[PDB]
Structure formats: C-alpha cells, structure tokens
Amino acid sequence: GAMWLTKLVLNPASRAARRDLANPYEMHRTLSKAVSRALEEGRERLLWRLEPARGLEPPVVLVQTLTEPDWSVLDEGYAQVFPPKPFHPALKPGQRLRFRLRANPAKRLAATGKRVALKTPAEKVAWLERRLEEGGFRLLEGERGPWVQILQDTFLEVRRKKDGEEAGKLLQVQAVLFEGRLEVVDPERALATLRRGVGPGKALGLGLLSVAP
RNA sequence: UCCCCACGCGUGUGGGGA
C-alpha cells in the first residue's frame, strides 16, 4: 500500500485551532474529518503528533494516514497546510534511522486488571524496546547504553470525571517523547509497525512513530 | 488516567476509544 504525511501549521488566531489545541478529543475530530470515509470503512489508522514548540513558532501538527486525506474540509483560516506527501517507506535490513515517538508506556496490572503507566525511565525505555523489537526494529546501542533519550515526560489533559454537578477528578495520560536511533531488522514488519503506530493514545496524539536518517 | 473488545499455566499481551 501507500502512506500519507501532512504538515499542519495551526493559526493561533483561529478559535477552532485553539479549541483543538486545548482538547485532544476536538483535535481528533477535526483531523478525522480529512479521512472520514476511509475511517468509517476501516481502511484508516489516523496518527498524529503535536510538535514541541520552538518558542514564537506556530504550533505544528504532524499527521499520518494510510489513505489520501482531504484538508479542504478544514475551516480557513485554520492552518497553513502544504499539500500532503505520498509516503513509501523504503526499509532495508540494517538500515539505521532516527525516530521520534510520543507514547504512553504501559502495562495491565495482572493484580488489579487495570492499565497503568510505567513509572521509571528504565521501565519506560524497556517498554519502548520491547515494542520496537516485536515490531521489526531494534534500538541502536551506543558505547554506553541504548541510543535513545527521553526528551520529555509530561501529563496530557484528556477529560474530567463526570461528578454530580461538581467538577470531579481530571483524567490524563502520561506522555513520553522518546528520541533516538534504531535499525530495521524485518522491513515488512517494521512497515506494519509504522502503519499501525505504537501503544495507547492514538486518539489523543500519541503512538506516532516517525523515522528518518 | 477512566471505559470497551479480543486473548493468557508468563507478578500479563494486543486492538479501539474518550
């Protein structure tokens, strides 16, 4: 098949841009409207990442789709958007690549049955590693440890626990931006993995594994 | 976080979503 990458530069003057900036559910709904049909028909895995700001630079949202998106669904002036690019990962064994992944390292407690965030850099890096290896990739290892860094570890505001007429607890996920390098071990599998994304929260702008030299 | 589904002789796994 083929893939698509789209760069949205959001207008901080746009109330809708800001609406979606503030709420992943919104952003998800806005984005989802570019690949609606394929979405309905099970032909689409929407994936996106909101890039960390370089200061006065506009917020920038990277989006991957299995199918051709139509951004004419966007209100203007929502975002300066450049024509989507057809994507065709040329993966070969041994090929080394840089990667960026905002994710939610997690496990299900066999004890409680509940899905919980891992707590330590170690556990978080181990998770990312299990996930990459099962996914046809392999972390590169420098002279001291894995060639991988946690650029940020923050909480992502999701939604509020409905409480009777009073504001309840906040629901949020732990979002971990990994950056590093890795090599392809099984091309086709690595492609599956890239087309699917990695771990929970795809609906909130997690799971998008990007790769390039 | 909070929920749902699919599995598990492994101190759990994978998929979706708000």
UniProtKB/Swiss-Prot annotation:
What does the record give as EC number?
3.1.-.-
Gene3D superfamilies in alphabetical order:
Crispr-associated protein, domain 1 (3.30.70.1200), Crispr-associated protein, domain 2 (3.30.70.1210)
**Family matches, as Pfam families:** CRISPR_assoc (PF08798)
Q: What is the effect of changing residue 36 to A?
A: 41% loss of cleavage activity
First-level EC class: hydrolase
Q: Do you know which InterPro entries this protein is assigned to?
A: CRISPR-assoc_prot_Cse3 (IPR010179)
Gene Ontology molecular function terms on file: endonuclease activity; RNA binding
- Which residue positions does UniProt flag as site: Stabilizes transition-state intermediate? 25
Which spans of this chain does the record mark as coiled coil? none
Q: Name its GO BP terms in alphabetical order.
A: defense response to virus
The protein's UniProt keywords, in alphabetical order, are: Antiviral defense, Endonuclease, Hydrolase, Nuclease, Plasmid, RNA-binding
Q: Tell me, in a sentence or two, what this protein's role is.
A: CRISPR (clustered regularly interspaced short palindromic repeat), is an adaptive immune system that provides protection against mobile genetic elements (viruses, transposable elements and conjugative plasmids). CRISPR clusters contain sequences complementary to antecedent mobile elements and target invading nucleic acids. CRISPR clusters are transcribed and processed into CRISPR RNA (crRNA). This enzyme processes pre-crRNA into individual crRNA units, but may not actually undergo enzyme turnover, retaining the crRNA product. Generates a 2',3'-cyclic phosphodiester.
Recorded family membership: Belongs to the CRISPR-associated protein Cas6/Cse3/CasE family. Subtype I-E/Ecoli subfamily.
Q: How does it assemble?
A: Probably part of the Cascade ribonucleoprotein complex. Monomer, retains crRNA after it is processed.
Q: What is this protein called?
A: CRISPR-associated endoribonuclease Cse3
Q: Which organism is it from?
A: Thermus thermophilus (strain ATCC 27634 / DSM 579 / HB8)
| Organism lineage string | Bacteria, Thermotogati, Deinococcota, Deinococci, Thermales
